[PDB]
Coordinates of C-alpha atoms and ligand atoms in Angstrom, one line a residue:
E1 CA 106.6 122.8 76.3
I2 CA 106.4 120.6 79.3
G3 CA 107.4 117.0 78.0
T4 CA 104.5 114.4 77.8
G5 CA 106.8 111.6 76.9
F6 CA 108.2 109.0 79.3
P7 CA 111.4 107.9 77.7
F8 CA 112.8 105.7 80.3
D9 CA 113.7 101.8 79.8
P10 CA 111.7 99.8 82.0
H11 CA 113.4 97.9 85.0
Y12 CA 111.8 95.5 87.3
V13 CA 113.0 93.8 90.7
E14 CA 111.0 91.2 92.4
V15 CA 109.9 92.3 96.0
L16 CA 107.9 90.6 98.4
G17 CA 106.7 88.2 95.8
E18 CA 105.5 90.9 93.6
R19 CA 107.1 92.8 90.5
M20 CA 108.0 96.4 91.0
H21 CA 108.7 98.8 88.3
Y22 CA 111.5 101.5 88.5
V23 CA 113.3 104.0 86.4
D24 CA 117.1 103.8 86.7
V25 CA 119.3 106.2 85.0
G26 CA 122.4 108.4 85.2
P27 CA 126.0 107.1 86.3
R28 CA 126.2 103.9 88.2
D29 CA 128.6 105.1 90.8
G30 CA 128.3 107.9 93.6
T31 CA 125.3 108.4 95.8
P32 CA 121.9 107.5 94.4
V33 CA 118.8 109.9 94.1
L34 CA 115.6 108.2 94.9
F35 CA 112.4 109.6 93.6
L36 CA 109.0 108.7 95.6
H37 CA 105.6 109.6 93.9
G38 CA 102.3 109.8 95.7
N39 CA 98.6 109.5 95.0
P40 CA 97.4 109.2 92.2
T41 CA 100.8 109.3 90.2
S42 CA 103.7 107.1 89.3
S43 CA 107.4 107.7 88.3
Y44 CA 105.8 109.6 85.4
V45 CA 105.2 112.6 87.7
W46 CA 109.2 113.0 87.8
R47 CA 109.8 112.6 84.1
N48 CA 110.7 116.4 83.6
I49 CA 112.8 116.6 86.7
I50 CA 115.0 113.6 86.6
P51 CA 116.8 114.9 83.2
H52 CA 118.2 117.8 85.4
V53 CA 119.6 115.2 87.8
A54 CA 120.7 112.5 85.6
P55 CA 123.8 114.0 83.9
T56 CA 125.7 113.8 87.3
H57 CA 123.7 111.3 89.5
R58 CA 121.9 108.1 89.6
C59 CA 118.1 108.5 89.5
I60 CA 116.0 105.6 90.7
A61 CA 112.1 106.3 90.6
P62 CA 110.1 103.3 91.6
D63 CA 106.4 102.7 91.0
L64 CA 104.5 102.0 94.2
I65 CA 102.9 98.5 94.4
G66 CA 99.7 98.7 93.0
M67 CA 100.4 101.8 91.0
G68 CA 102.4 102.5 87.7
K69 CA 103.8 99.7 86.0
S70 CA 104.4 97.7 89.3
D71 CA 102.4 94.6 89.8
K72 CA 98.9 94.9 91.4
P73 CA 98.2 92.1 93.8
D74 CA 94.8 91.7 96.0
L75 CA 96.0 93.8 98.9
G76 CA 94.2 96.6 101.0
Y77 CA 97.0 98.9 100.1
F78 CA 97.3 100.5 103.5
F79 CA 100.3 102.7 104.0
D80 CA 101.6 99.9 106.1
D81 CA 101.8 97.7 102.8
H82 CA 103.5 100.6 100.9
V83 CA 106.0 100.7 103.8
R84 CA 106.8 97.0 103.4
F85 CA 107.1 97.1 99.8
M86 CA 109.3 100.2 99.9
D87 CA 111.5 99.0 102.5
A88 CA 112.3 95.8 100.5
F89 CA 112.6 97.5 97.2
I90 CA 115.3 99.7 98.8
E91 CA 117.1 96.8 100.2
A92 CA 116.8 94.7 97.0
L93 CA 118.5 97.4 95.1
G94 CA 121.3 97.2 97.6
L95 CA 121.1 100.9 98.3
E96 CA 123.3 102.1 101.2
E97 CA 123.3 106.1 101.3
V98 CA 120.9 107.8 99.4
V99 CA 119.4 111.3 98.7
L100 CA 115.5 111.3 98.7
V101 CA 113.3 113.4 96.7
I102 CA 109.9 112.9 97.7
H103 CA 106.2 113.9 97.2
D104 CA 102.6 113.3 98.9
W105 CA 102.3 109.9 99.9
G106 CA 105.9 109.3 98.7
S107 CA 107.1 111.6 101.2
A108 CA 105.3 110.0 104.0
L109 CA 107.1 106.9 102.8
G110 CA 110.5 109.0 102.6
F111 CA 110.4 110.5 105.9
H112 CA 109.2 107.4 107.8
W113 CA 112.1 105.6 106.1
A114 CA 114.5 108.5 107.0
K115 CA 113.6 108.4 110.6
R116 CA 114.4 104.6 110.8
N117 CA 117.7 105.0 108.8
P118 CA 118.9 108.5 109.5
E119 CA 122.5 107.4 109.0
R120 CA 121.7 106.5 105.5
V121 CA 120.0 109.6 104.3
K122 CA 122.2 112.3 102.8
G123 CA 119.8 114.9 102.1
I124 CA 115.8 115.2 101.5
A125 CA 114.3 117.1 99.0
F126 CA 110.4 117.4 99.4
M127 CA 107.4 119.2 98.3
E128 CA 103.5 119.1 99.1
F129 CA 104.2 116.4 101.8
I130 CA 102.1 114.7 104.3
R131 CA 101.9 116.3 107.8
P132 CA 99.2 116.2 110.3
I133 CA 96.0 118.2 109.3
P134 CA 94.7 119.3 112.7
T135 CA 91.4 120.3 111.3
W136 CA 89.2 120.0 108.0
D137 CA 88.6 124.0 108.3
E138 CA 92.1 124.1 106.8
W139 CA 90.3 123.1 103.5
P140 CA 87.8 124.8 101.1
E141 CA 84.3 123.5 101.0
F142 CA 84.8 121.5 97.6
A143 CA 87.8 119.8 98.8
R144 CA 86.4 119.1 102.4
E145 CA 83.1 117.6 101.2
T146 CA 84.9 115.4 98.4
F147 CA 87.6 114.2 100.7
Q148 CA 85.0 113.6 103.5
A149 CA 83.0 111.6 100.8
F150 CA 86.0 109.6 99.9
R151 CA 86.5 108.4 103.5
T152 CA 83.7 105.9 103.4
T153 CA 83.3 102.5 102.1
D154 CA 80.0 103.3 100.3
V155 CA 80.3 106.8 98.5
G156 CA 84.0 106.8 98.7
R157 CA 84.3 103.7 96.8
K158 CA 81.5 104.5 94.3
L159 CA 83.4 107.7 93.7
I160 CA 87.0 106.4 93.3
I161 CA 86.5 102.7 92.4
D162 CA 83.5 102.9 90.3
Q163 CA 83.6 106.3 88.8
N164 CA 87.5 107.0 88.9
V165 CA 87.1 110.4 90.2
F166 CA 90.4 110.7 91.9
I167 CA 92.0 110.3 88.5
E168 CA 89.6 112.2 86.2
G169 CA 88.6 114.8 88.8
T170 CA 91.1 115.2 91.7
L171 CA 94.2 114.6 89.7
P172 CA 93.8 117.7 87.3
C173 CA 92.6 119.8 90.2
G174 CA 95.9 119.4 91.8
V175 CA 97.6 121.2 88.8
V176 CA 97.7 125.0 88.1
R177 CA 98.3 124.4 84.4
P178 CA 95.9 122.2 82.2
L179 CA 97.2 118.7 81.6
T180 CA 96.9 117.3 78.2
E181 CA 95.0 114.3 77.3
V182 CA 98.2 112.6 76.5
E183 CA 99.4 113.2 80.0
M184 CA 96.0 112.2 81.4
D185 CA 96.6 109.0 79.6
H186 CA 99.9 108.2 81.2
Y187 CA 98.1 108.7 84.6
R188 CA 95.2 106.8 83.5
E189 CA 97.1 103.8 82.2
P190 CA 97.4 101.8 85.5
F191 CA 93.9 102.0 86.5
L192 CA 92.0 101.1 83.4
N193 CA 90.4 98.1 85.2
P194 CA 88.3 99.4 88.1
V195 CA 89.4 96.4 90.5
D196 CA 92.8 98.0 90.3
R197 CA 91.7 101.4 91.7
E198 CA 92.0 100.1 95.3
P199 CA 95.2 102.1 96.3
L200 CA 93.5 105.4 95.0
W201 CA 90.8 104.9 97.5
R202 CA 92.7 103.6 100.6
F203 CA 95.3 106.4 100.2
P204 CA 92.7 109.1 101.0
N205 CA 91.4 107.0 103.8
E206 CA 94.8 106.9 105.4
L207 CA 95.3 110.8 105.3
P208 CA 96.1 112.1 108.9
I209 CA 93.0 114.7 109.2
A210 CA 91.5 115.8 112.3
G211 CA 93.2 113.0 114.3
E212 CA 92.0 110.0 112.0
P213 CA 93.3 107.4 111.5
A214 CA 95.0 107.8 114.9
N215 CA 97.7 105.3 113.8
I216 CA 98.7 107.4 110.9
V217 CA 98.6 110.5 112.7
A218 CA 101.0 109.1 115.2
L219 CA 103.4 107.7 112.6
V220 CA 103.6 111.2 110.9
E221 CA 103.9 113.0 114.3
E222 CA 106.7 110.8 114.8
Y223 CA 108.6 111.3 111.5
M224 CA 107.9 115.3 111.8
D225 CA 109.5 115.3 115.2
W226 CA 112.7 113.6 113.8
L227 CA 112.5 116.0 111.0
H228 CA 112.8 119.0 113.2
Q229 CA 115.7 117.5 115.3
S230 CA 117.7 115.9 112.5
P231 CA 120.4 118.3 110.6
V232 CA 120.1 116.4 107.3
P233 CA 120.3 118.9 104.5
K234 CA 116.9 119.8 103.4
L235 CA 115.3 121.3 100.4
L236 CA 111.5 122.3 100.5
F237 CA 109.7 123.6 97.2
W238 CA 106.5 125.3 97.7
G239 CA 103.9 127.1 95.5
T240 CA 100.9 129.5 95.6
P241 CA 98.2 128.7 96.8
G242 CA 99.6 125.2 97.4
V243 CA 97.5 122.3 98.9
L244 CA 99.1 120.2 101.5
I245 CA 101.5 123.0 102.1
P246 CA 100.1 126.6 101.8
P247 CA 102.8 129.5 101.9
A248 CA 102.6 130.2 105.6
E249 CA 103.2 126.5 106.4
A250 CA 106.2 126.6 103.8
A251 CA 107.6 129.6 105.6
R252 CA 107.3 128.0 109.0
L253 CA 108.9 124.9 108.1
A254 CA 111.7 126.9 106.1
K255 CA 112.9 128.5 109.4
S256 CA 112.0 125.7 111.8
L257 CA 113.5 122.9 110.1
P258 CA 117.4 122.6 110.6
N259 CA 119.4 123.1 107.4
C260 CA 116.6 123.8 105.0
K261 CA 116.6 125.6 101.9
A262 CA 113.3 126.7 100.7
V263 CA 112.3 127.4 96.9
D264 CA 109.4 129.1 95.9
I265 CA 108.2 127.7 92.4
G266 CA 105.6 130.3 91.7
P267 CA 102.1 129.0 91.1
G268 CA 101.5 125.6 92.2
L269 CA 98.7 123.3 93.8
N270 CA 99.7 119.5 94.8
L271 CA 101.7 118.3 91.7
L272 CA 104.5 121.0 91.7
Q273 CA 106.4 118.9 89.1
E274 CA 103.8 119.7 86.5
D275 CA 103.8 123.3 87.1
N276 CA 107.5 124.2 87.4
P277 CA 109.8 121.0 86.6
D278 CA 112.5 123.2 85.2
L279 CA 113.2 125.1 88.4
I280 CA 112.6 122.2 90.7
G281 CA 114.9 119.8 88.7
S282 CA 117.5 122.7 88.2
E283 CA 117.6 123.5 92.1
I284 CA 117.9 119.9 93.0
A285 CA 120.9 119.3 90.8
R286 CA 122.5 122.6 92.2
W287 CA 121.5 121.6 95.8
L288 CA 123.2 118.2 95.1
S289 CA 126.3 119.9 94.2
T290 CA 126.5 121.2 97.7
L291 CA 126.1 118.2 99.5
Ligands
8LL1 C1 98.1 114.0 98.3 C2 96.4 114.2 98.1 C3 96.0 115.4 98.9 C4 95.0 116.2 98.0 C5 96.4 115.5 93.3 O1 95.4 116.4 93.5 C6 95.4 117.4 94.6 C7 94.0 118.0 94.5 N1 93.5 118.0 96.0 S1 92.2 118.9 96.3 O2 91.0 118.1 96.6 O3 91.3 119.1 95.0 C8 92.3 120.3 97.3 C9 92.4 120.2 98.6 C10 92.6 121.4 99.4 C11 92.6 122.6 98.9 C12 92.7 122.8 97.4 C13 92.7 124.0 96.7 N2 92.9 125.2 97.6 C14 92.1 126.0 98.1 C15 94.4 125.7 97.9 C16 92.7 124.1 95.4 C17 92.4 123.0 94.5 C18 92.3 121.8 95.3 C19 92.5 121.7 96.6
CL2 CL1 95.5 110.8 99.0

């Protein structure tokens, strides 16, 4: 039974005029472990991983601005807006050195932060993360047509803003096991008002695919170059068939990235946390003990 509950007291901090919500559990001392979720999830995606880590480490898991239980201002919710809010969140909590556990757009946030603050990062655990996607040929027909549809201000907004397709359609397609309606309700909660679904649409329009948008492709190429040269301890989780990171890509990264341990979680698509939380949390705790 994969737990469906979210038993964490809410914490809030004011960041750039907006309230950001975060989970904060574990001992107050030591190096903190910072969990960054992506699209279209929240700290909820970490709920069954954090308990493997909280016995011996501080766990901080924020909700991105406009997502989860964080405030929802009238922004475009560009990656750049998320960079500003996450930078500020980390300083507002007074974090110095951290370990990162990051996923999907959370990973783009983490890597881009790590690149800009390499002396402050003691380890990075990552999974199903954002890397440049050279061609649409890498995706199957349905995914290709859907995400190409997403990347317009007409049909894309109709699908994601009006019809809430990213939550009701895409999200369960990123999990091998069937999500329950209780879990779905936790993922749905932040976007019950359609005007609040703006981040769900801007994120796929930011994905670095076949060279566009050029600025996001450049930013991501930068932090990937950094990641290939830094000796920071790395822990890569991957599954089969995977989505952003197919088994061949995981193998490549496992050998080419310095100081990288790779863990096969078994069956998985994008939300690896929902398919093997026990192994992911267990391995993160284990890996942490070696840092
Ligand atoms: C971060 C965001 C990126 C995505 C959350 O949802 C993840 C679902 N993504 S998807 O469009 O349905 C999708 C894309 C590419 C391949 C897919 C696939 N094969 C063929 C391995 C199976 C199922 C869905 C696939
Ligand atoms: Cl996305």
